[PDB]
Amino acid sequence: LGKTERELLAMVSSIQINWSVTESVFPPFSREMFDRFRSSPPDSEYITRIVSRCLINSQEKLINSSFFAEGNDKALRFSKNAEECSLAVERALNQYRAEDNLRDLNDHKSTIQLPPWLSYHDVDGKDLCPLQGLDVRGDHPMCNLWREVVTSANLEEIERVYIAALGVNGKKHKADTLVQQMRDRSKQPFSPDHDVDHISEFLSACSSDLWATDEDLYSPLSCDKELRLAAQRIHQPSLSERGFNEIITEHYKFMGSRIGSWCQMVSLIGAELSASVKQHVKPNYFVIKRLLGSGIFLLIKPTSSKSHIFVSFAIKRSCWAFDLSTSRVFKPYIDAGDLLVTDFVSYKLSKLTNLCKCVSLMESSFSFWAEAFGIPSWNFVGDLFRSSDSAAMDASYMGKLSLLTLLEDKAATEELQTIARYIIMEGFVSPPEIPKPHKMTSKFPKVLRSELQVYLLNCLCRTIQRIAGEPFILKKKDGSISWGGMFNPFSGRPLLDMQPLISCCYNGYFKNKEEETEPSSLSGMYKKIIELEHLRPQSDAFLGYKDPELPRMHEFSVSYLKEACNHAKLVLRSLYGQNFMEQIDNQIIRELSGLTLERLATLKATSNFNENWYVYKDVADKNYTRDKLLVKMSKYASEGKSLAIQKFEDCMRQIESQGCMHICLFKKQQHGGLREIYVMGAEERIVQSVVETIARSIGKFFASDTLCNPPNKVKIPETHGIRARKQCKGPVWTCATSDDARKWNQGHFVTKFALMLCEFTSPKWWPLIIRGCSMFTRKRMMMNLNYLKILDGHRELDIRDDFVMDLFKAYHGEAEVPWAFKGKTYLETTTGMMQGILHYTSSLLHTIHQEYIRSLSFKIFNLKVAPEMSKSLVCDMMQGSDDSSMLISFPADDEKVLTRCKVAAAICFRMKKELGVYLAIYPSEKSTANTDFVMEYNSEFYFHTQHVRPTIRWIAACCSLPEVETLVARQEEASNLMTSVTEGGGSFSLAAMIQQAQCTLHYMLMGMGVSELFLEYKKAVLKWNDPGLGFFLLDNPYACGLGGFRFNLFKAITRTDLQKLYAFFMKETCSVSPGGALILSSLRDRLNIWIELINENPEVLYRAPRTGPEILLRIAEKVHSSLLQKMAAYSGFHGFNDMEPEDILFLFPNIEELESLDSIVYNKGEIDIIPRVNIRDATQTRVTIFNEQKTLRTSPEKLVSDKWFGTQKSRIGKTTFLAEWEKLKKIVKWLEDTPEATLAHTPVRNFFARMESKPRTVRITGAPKIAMVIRDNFSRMGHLRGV
Structure with a gap:
């Protein structure tokens, strides 16, 4: 043992337990708890009683659910199931109808709030000259407003960013208060019986005009042909002589389409609004603007709200060509003679991001959907024009649905879309169970906000009725497992390929990765913390003292937990031999030895929450700030501490002085996963790091734990079939189930974690554990300061949500609740797990539970059917944080044995869920039971042999502009997203299309289509084709997403003039990029506690640090890890330079792999x-x-x-x-x-x-x-x- 090991052991021994303070501060923990738990053996009789009760309950539930009471035929049973489903659906619909103040059935509100116009080009520039000399007619208020506008323009009273500053008749629509009242009058909920016929008409119809690319429509984003040609020349010089390849050809064809023109128009609208909102220059005026080279005019006003922007669109009659579609879906407009105008429209500041990226996202979505149904990605638009098969109609329907949902960008729509996954997964349930899709009816949104939501709800109801009426039919022959009867959840048309179906299920994920807050309507987050806290038992007798007979919320059985611990210990003894305890001890010692201050010293975030922020009145003006782990960890290390364990004890003492967690919350405004974030303090971070490290160390030994063994996740299902065939020695039959937990995060008490962790560790770690867990028994969570500011001055009748009422009453002292206090600024809680802060321990608990249920399932098969079958069947587990899956495989030779096997497997699947309660594992409705040759895990689906993934999840993610920094950084992160999507199961051609979308987005980011000066920029960047100036590198289409940014740079330097610049650096100025590019583009004071020091001792860079100053050096190196003017400055780089393979080797150490790929993917010409x-x-x-x-x-x-x-x-x-x-x-x-x-x-x-x-x-x-x-x-x- 090295010095680190012995000193760490000595210090750990120095840590001691102080039972008095722990008992006083934290109620539920006591010496007697752990002493009795470690001493008393589990009660076998109680365990047997509960197991028998679970068996009886499972049998009764199975019999009642599937209607086996009379022994009816399949027809009558399915009829009863359909009747029940219809009753449930009618109940939900009536509950919706029961609401008051419902929106009228005919009061149409357009889902898309934009005109359907499509027009030609006009005089270039952003000047307002075209407005002059227009005779607008009409009497509508907007007609008169724009009449005044054109009159002012003729009189040239517009100031300059042009400002109208109109006068009389500016009121009666803009009183500074009218409009914000007007769009506030859209609170009426929508009835389920609302007329939504026009949506169906627009979606599924003979819509071929959308794809006719002619007439020279307005297309401001088609001015970069030369750049794309140059990029293509890099990889296919021979073909580039002829012209564009297929991919670029269809990209520009789609640009030339009607939908392409409209998408470009709306994207320009979004960019223009995003630019306008930054101005804030008007005293009290209007701001008028014109789109580049077009007759589009936007009359804009930001209000005093500072969260809504009001727009009015106008188009010249002479320039307007026609309308994209006459349906009610788009915003209706008003004729005014020389001009066509629409009413004012209010937009939230969040939607502008969606508006800007519209064209790229839609190109991506259409390409992906066309590819999914079999249409080639590089040739689809023409196929869409000649719609002659169900595939084309389905693809167009799905693209239009993507259009609607993107333009609506409301979360409730996304959840409604995602529910279809669980709705349709129910169709794979095999006998003796029957599908119960209607059980998801409880997951519908509480209120309806848009016509699109009503249409989606009706489609979902029809799908549920159809599925409950008749499940999917299986077809087996010569090992050719197949299904029949599948249909799209939304369109309802038949389907035959698993991949498009799964993509339909997961369509609701359009991750844009917005790392910002979201003040409006976040109460649910807070609600999500409270719903169980009021259910805490008034007595702790069932929190680790005794064994409940009928467990309630937060309760668990001590004897069952100890029995599971013993069973897991026996399994480990069988696997790793008798000395498994010392192996675990060595593993944990090694893990803690490598747990340094440095590894935790990442950016992330921390909370500065102390007692100073408890009272809201004291802090009302000071803005709360989130500190980075870097400064605190560096300060701690400066004391002279090397390992993160070293500062444990003292840190916890501070926590012991506080006696409560000091957590703060964060809501991401991204429309997808990981919205919840629980930022947490430094001392809490170090303690939780120690606890999670030891949890992961103990859990690594279990093979079935996917979290600790990510390889096992993909290994187990694949080898499952081989093992089953080897064991059964013949044809096999597989049953499976995927389960999800209900209120996993806030359903667990903490004592059981401490108990089970102590059972698996030597005594010297016990004080480290029991203490480290007790700190969770009381936690205070801050809220957003703006939230409290709003709440304080809101008075009564705030909102119909009862949670807000309760919070308001408690904050003012009108009511008393255990989870809030009058005048304070935090929520106090006794339970909870704060969304994965305690992540590995939960997985370990789930692992042990599944090991025990595996043993029980073996016993049940031995009992109910035949004694000796355990020798000839296979059972497999998979567990993570909360998702789980069970696999069973048995011989399929005898029909009677097969039926008995299926019955027993269903019984065991119900056993798992029923017995999970006793460890506070509450099953969720999302779980799917008894599906044959079907398995789900982390959204990965295994249809017998086929392994499918929801590729669409990564499509919308690929289109984003985060991280800013340098342009080359942007390009390389784009390459990273390309790698992510291609490894997600997409085809390379689809990846090339996404790269085209990224190219157009990136080019318009510098202003292509926004400023005339971009044309000059194109003149310059073309000559030097340097990515450092924003030049975009299109990868070889045949292998895009694989070679990556390194491949792009290598090919660029191989032959282009770009190398002459790099040699200039070998013989505004900035450093090299992580990708190796010598880019040029266009905190440290607080870390006062170096290049020369590293040079003196390079060994620091090549080993884990053991002292303070080296840790400081490592974190320090972690920290340090105009365009026309710039091209003018480059005129001095006339140095004559040549090729040098050594420079390439220095830049790229992996040249062999790059050239190996080059030898195949270089200059392949056309596609066959x-x-x-x-x-x-x-x-x-x-x-x-x-x-x-x-x-x-x-x-x-x-x-x-x-x-x-x-x-x-x-x-x-x-x-x-x-x-x-x-x-x-x-x-x-x-x-x-x-x-x-x-x-x-x-x-x-x-x-x-x-x-x-x-x-x-x-x-x-x-x-x-x-x-x-x-x-x-x-x-x-x-x-x-x-x-």
């Missing part, structure tokens, strides 16, 4: 693809940098550190080590046997420390060697030829 036949098995494959001959015996870093410092971690022969060193030396010319000579000779230490890259490993899912992957994964409709 042979269509495939039916479906094939999905096979995992290793693709890139798999070889080790060129990648050396071990990593270059290991060899360098062994040579310079003798770390002897290479574990190779001495002569082998010398040979490896010599071959590296001939690889690396400037590498020397000493750090000093190497530093002097090479053309600081950090820059040459990380140049050893060793890129990551990539795996792909082929559908039957890099050539194989590229030929079989370019497109899903076929495979390449000649490769």
